[PDB]
């Protein structure tokens, strides 16, 4: 496929134009009716909203400016918006609008009613290998796309993968995403998904995303992650030992792929070798995978979330609701000028 190579070069050109001249201020708060909280965090939350003029539903991420500054997450938050407004791929949640007011930053994303892979995985227990492979292929293509733009994702986990109406994956949460050529050092991610080099503070590159994919595939197929414990420190100890045990039901091909992704030695890890992503795409475990058909979304999904209207929130957990405050005074104006 010289196809992929020319798709990616054209993709980079579109990305670079938007990266260099980002869109800003494309809606305002009173154009949306807020319906229900879909998730929370230490400096913000995500709400289901309805856009009054179209009637469309969106997921609106609301960030408290003062809290973002206090917790020293300015660069990460600016990274998120700048990257989101510039990318475009079948398996990435789309940013539809963004704006800010006196108190908050807002990113209005497409709403994916099927809920997080997390909920479905815990409920079902584990996914069959073809089911896990279907999702894994989507992540492979998405990381190929992101890494080609010099982006590192850094927060792969089932909680950040939404299942759409066609049963396909939509990756959300670009809060730790960064455009970087060369090494970076920020200790971020989720404990169970951190690569050894992050934990050991040595500097790391995009190979950490491929390690995380190994953890994700293991967790989808097993129903539990390869390294778990009640405290992060004990999890880290297991991760850096790199000893992995596999369930009895894992196929030989799956175990071999995972030995190569969950390789503690950076320089031997699939995705990070001479042939790059092709080592993964060409692996026996993916022999049945039609990569083009996946990209084109022509493969029949193994699972479709039950759907009862746009606006249905049954696939999401209940959260405690709270006011959206907008101060009469502008907060942190200079810090977020480019947002």
């Amino acid at each position: 496929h010289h196809h992929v190579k020319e798709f990616l070069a054209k993709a980079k050109e579109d990305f670079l134009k938007k990266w260099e001249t980002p869109s800003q201020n494309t809606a305002q708060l009173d154009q949306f009716d807020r319906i229900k909280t879909l998730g929370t965090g230490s400096f913000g939350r995500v709400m289901l909203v309805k856009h009054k003029e179209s009637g469309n539903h969106y997921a609106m991420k609301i960030l408290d400016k003062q809290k973002v500054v206090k917790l020293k997450q300015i660069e990460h938050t600016l990274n998120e918006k700048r990257i989101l407004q510039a990318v475009n791929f079948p398996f990435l949640v789309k940013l539809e609008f963004s704006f800010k007011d006196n108190s908050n930053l807002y990113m209005v994303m497409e709403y994916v009613a099927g809920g997080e892979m997390f909920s479905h995985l815990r409920r079902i227990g584990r996914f069959s290998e073809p089911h896990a492979r279907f999702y894994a292929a989507q992540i492979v293509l998405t990381f190929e796309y992101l890494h080609s733009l010099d982006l590192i994702y850094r927060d792969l986990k089932p909680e950040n993968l939404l299942i759409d109406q066609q049963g396909y994956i939509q990756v959300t949460d670009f809060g730790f995403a960064k455009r970087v050529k060369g090494r970076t050092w920020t200790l971020c991610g989720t404990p169970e998904y951190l690569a050894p080099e992050i934990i050991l503070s040595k500097g790391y590159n995009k190979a950490v995303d491929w390690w995380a994919l190994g953890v994700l595939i293991y967790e989808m197929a097993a129903g539990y992650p390869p390294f778990f414990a009640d405290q992060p420190i004990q999890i880290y100890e297991k991760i850096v030992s790199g000893k992995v045990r596999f369930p009895s039901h894992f196929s030989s091909d799956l175990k071999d792929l995972l030995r190569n992704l969950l390789q503690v030695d950076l320089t031997k890890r699939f995705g990070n070798l001479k042939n790059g992503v092709n080592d993964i795409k060409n692996h026996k475990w993916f022999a049945t995978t039609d990569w083009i058909a996946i990209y084109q979304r022509k493969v029949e999904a193994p699972f479709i979330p039950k759907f009862k209207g746009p606006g249905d929130t049954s696939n999401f957990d209940d959260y405690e609701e709270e006011e959206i405050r907008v101060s009469i005074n502008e907060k942190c104006g200079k810090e977020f000028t480019e947002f």
Binding site: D155, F176, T186, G189, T190, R245, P247
Partner: peptide
């Protein structure tokens, strides 16, 4: 079993991201 140990553990719910 490993599964039973996981399910009895404190980390079966949605996992918070960290930065540090």
């Amino acid at each position: 079993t490993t599964y039973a140990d996981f399910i009895a553990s404190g980390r079966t719910g949605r996992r918070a991201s960290i930065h540090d």
